[PDB]
């Protein structure tokens, strides 16, 4: 069937040397392959509201005691451009993680499978166009004979 | 290469105000943008067995001390329709989370890239069809001349 | 917009009977639907370096006190073929999990949507080819009349 796994989409952020939340930690979000702590490298981040509206907020993003992103005391869904770097720091200012391009961590790879398939159809379209131009040329020849 | 990240696909469910599992918590699964606690809004959920078979089970789903979904004392893979709402409650009956449409939390976005590409091929197909109809009309004209 | 959720891509590995990291645990990676503890079933695993280079390493993969994969004392990104089995064991040698095919746990399903769309374009291409062959046959007939 088309059935798919039940999952838990809201991310949690945990430390790298012990099993603990990054409580009162900070997340920076930047251009791919840059240092997002530098404001010059930061990109727009937005709360995506329940109704679908978007509100831009400042960086860093704040991680609560549960390891979840919060704004004004509430859980929030933060969105940005698929391709971005991310740096995570704990309340001590120690770096927990750095990801140069979050898009390069996809375990699901149905993008590239599709790109092959698109390239294949384009090849059939080229051959079809070649047949058409040949037919056009046959017609031109006929017209000349009879005219 | 086509190599992709090693990941941990089985979800865990943790609390929202402290870093703890939702031990003996409950998960409800419903139509997109509805309250899944209401039985009228619930949709079928299934254990997907090791052999690929599916067994429908009742709601709520049960979360163990580890924060993993269990049935009859064993870890299970639960499946449902990609588009669904989810509500998670702790053993105290407090709401941990509500997700209106789990599909809208995809960080991987290779669906929409493909939809542009499909629309583009369809455009080439339209132009090809226009050439063909023009050729048909030229042939009709020739037939009339010679007939 | 094309905006997508901020997430936490680096996996963490936690126990199945209590809420704890699989500290000093082991991960085996194998062919789909096999027992990856058996070396005969294991497949190549690689560190994907910051610069994009790949270095093959031995199995098992090692899980640190934080539940993250490490090599030579540092966090690492491990890659392999999308389709693989995975088995996870704790420091006691107890099995934490077994996943027959990690690819079958995708909650995002934009592969199969695309495969329908590809099949549909291929159908238009068949009909287009039929029109073309019919036109070719009309031209052959004309040539015979006039020749």
**8 Å CB contact of B20 and C19:** yes
* Residue B61, C-beta contacts closer than 8 angstroms, at least 6 positions apart: A6, B26, B27, B28, B29, B45, B69, B78
Half-sphere exposure at residue A123, Cβ-oriented, CA atoms within 13 angstroms: 6
Backbone φ and ψ of A140, nearest 5°: -55, -45
CA nearest neighbour of B80 among B36, B38, B124? B36
Residue carrying the six token digits 């924060």: B67
- A77: its two tokens: 């869904």
- The order of strands in the sheet holding C78-80 is B4-5, C78-80, C45-48, C54-57
Q: What is the sign, positive or negative, of the torsion defined by CA atoms of A19, A20, A21, A22?
A: negative
Which one-letter DSSP state was computed for residue A102?
G
Q: Are strands C45-48 and A95-99 parallel, antiparallel or unpaired?
A: unpaired
Determine the Cα–Cα distance for residues C77 and B134; give it in Å rounded to an integer: 57
User: Between chains, do B77 and C105 touch, taking CB under 8 Å as contact?
Assistant: yes
CA distance to partner chain C, nearest, from residue A138 (Å): 8
Q: How far apart are CA B54 and CA C83, in angstroms?
A: 21
> Taking CB atoms and an 8 Å cutoff, what residues of chain B touch A142?
142
Q: For residue A78, what is the nearest residue in chain B, using CA coordinates? A: B105
Secondary element (H or E) of residue B125: helix B111-146
Give the Cα separation of A10 and A39 in Å (integer).
Answer: 26
Nearest Cα neighbor of A89 from A21, A26, A20, A131 is A26
Closest to A96 measured CA to CA, from C78, C68, B6, C52 = C68
Q: Is B70 on the interface with C (CB under 8 A)?
A: no
* CA dist., res. B77 & res. B50, Å (int): 9
Q: CA C2 to CA B130: how far, in whole Å?
A: 33
Say how many CB pairs under 8 Å bridge B and C.
121
> What are the Cα distances from residue A75, in Å, to A22, A49, A87, B87, B98?
15, 11, 20, 14, 10
CB B29 within 8 A of CB B45: yes
Q: What are the respective helix, strand and coil percentages of chain A, to the nearest 5?
A: 30, 25, 45
Per-residue 3-state assignment (H helix, E strand, C coil) for C68-133: CEEECCEECCEEECCCCEEEEECCCCCEEEEECCHHHHCCCCCHHHHHHHHHHHHHHHHHHHHHHH
A102 closest CA partner among B106, B101, C111, C142 = B106
Q: Contacts of residue C14 in chain A, CB cutoff 8 Å? A: 19
DSSP state of A58: P
CB contact (8 A) between residue C68 and residue A16: yes
Peptide bond into C146 cis (omega under 30): no
> Omega of the bond prior to C33 within 30 degrees of 0, cis?
no
Q: B109 CB contacts (<8 Å, ≥6 apart)? A: A82, C2, C4
Residue C34 tokens read as 């096999």
Pairing of strands B78-80, B45-48: antiparallel
| Residue C5: strand pairing partners | A79
Which regions of B68-124 does DSSP assign to beta strands (E)? 69-71, 74-75, 78-80, 85-89, 95-99
Tokens for A34?
């840059």
Report CA dihedral (B118, B123, B127, B130) to the nearest 10 degrees. 90
String of b and e for A40-73 (b: at least 16 CB within 10 Å)? ebbbebbbbeeeeeeeeeebbbbbbebbbbbeee
Q: Are A85 and C50 in contact (CB under 8 A)?
A: no
Strands across the sheet with B26-30, in order? B74-75, B69-71, B61-63, B26-30, B85-89, B95-99
For residue A5, the surrounding DSSP H or E stretch is: strand A4-5
Regarding beta strands A61-63 and A69-71, do their DSSP bridges make them parallel or antiparallel, or are they unpaired? antiparallel
What value does the CA radius of gyration of chain A take, rounded to a whole number of Å? Answer: 26
Structure tokens at A30: 């930047």
Q: What's the Cα-to-Cα distance from A59 to each of A12, A39, A86, C3, rounded to whole Å?
A: 18, 9, 12, 17
Strand residue runs (E) in A6-84: 26-30, 45-48, 54-57, 61-63, 69-71, 74-75, 78-80
Work out the minimum CA distance from B7 to partner chain C, whole angstroms: 5
Q: List, in order of start, the domains of chain C with CATH numbers.
A: 1-104 (2.170.14.10)
- Chain A residues with CB under 8 Å of C65 CB are 17-19
What's the count of helices (H) and strands (E) in chain A, helices before strands?
A: 1, 10
Q: Print burial letters for A9-36: b (CB count within 10 Å at least 16), e (below 16).
A: bbbbbbbbeebebbbebbbbbbbbebeb
Element (H, E) at A125: helix A111-146
Cβ within 8 Å, pair C6-A12 = no
Query: What six digits make up the tokens of B51?
Result: 């052999």
Look up residue A102 and give its two tokens: 């979050």
Residues β-bridged to residue A44: none
- Could C20 and A19 be called an inter-chain contact, meaning their C-beta atoms sit closer than 8 Å? yes
Please give the C-alpha separations between residue A27 and each of A69, B19, B98, C58, C69, in angstroms, as whole numbers: 9, 18, 23, 33, 21
Q: In Å, what is the CA distance from A143 to each residue of A73, C31, C138, C141?
A: 79, 63, 14, 14
Of C81, C114, C145, the CB nearest to B114: C114
Which among C18, C79, C107 has the least Cβ separation from residue B4? C79
Euclidean distance between CA atoms A93 and A88, whole angstroms: 9
């Amino acid at each position: 069937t088309a059935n798919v796994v039940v999952s838990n989409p809201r991310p949690i952020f945990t430390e790298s040397r012990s099993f603990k939340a990054v409580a009162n930690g900070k997340i920076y979000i930047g251009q791919i392959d840059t240092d997002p702590v530098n404001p010059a490298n930061q990109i727009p981040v937005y709360i995506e509201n329940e109704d679908g509206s978007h509100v831009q907020i400042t960086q860093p993003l704040i991680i609560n005691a549960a390891g979840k992103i919060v704004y004004n005391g509430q859980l929030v869904k933060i969105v940005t451009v698929q391709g971005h770097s991310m740096a995570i720091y704990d309340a001590n200012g120690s770096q927990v993680d750095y990801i140069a391009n979050v898009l390069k961590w996809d375990p699901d790879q149905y993008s590239i499978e599709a790109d092959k398939k698109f390239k294949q159809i384009e090849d059939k379209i080229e051959e079809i166009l070649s047949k058409i131009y040949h037919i056009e040329n046959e017609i031109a020849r006929i017209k000349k004979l009879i005219g």
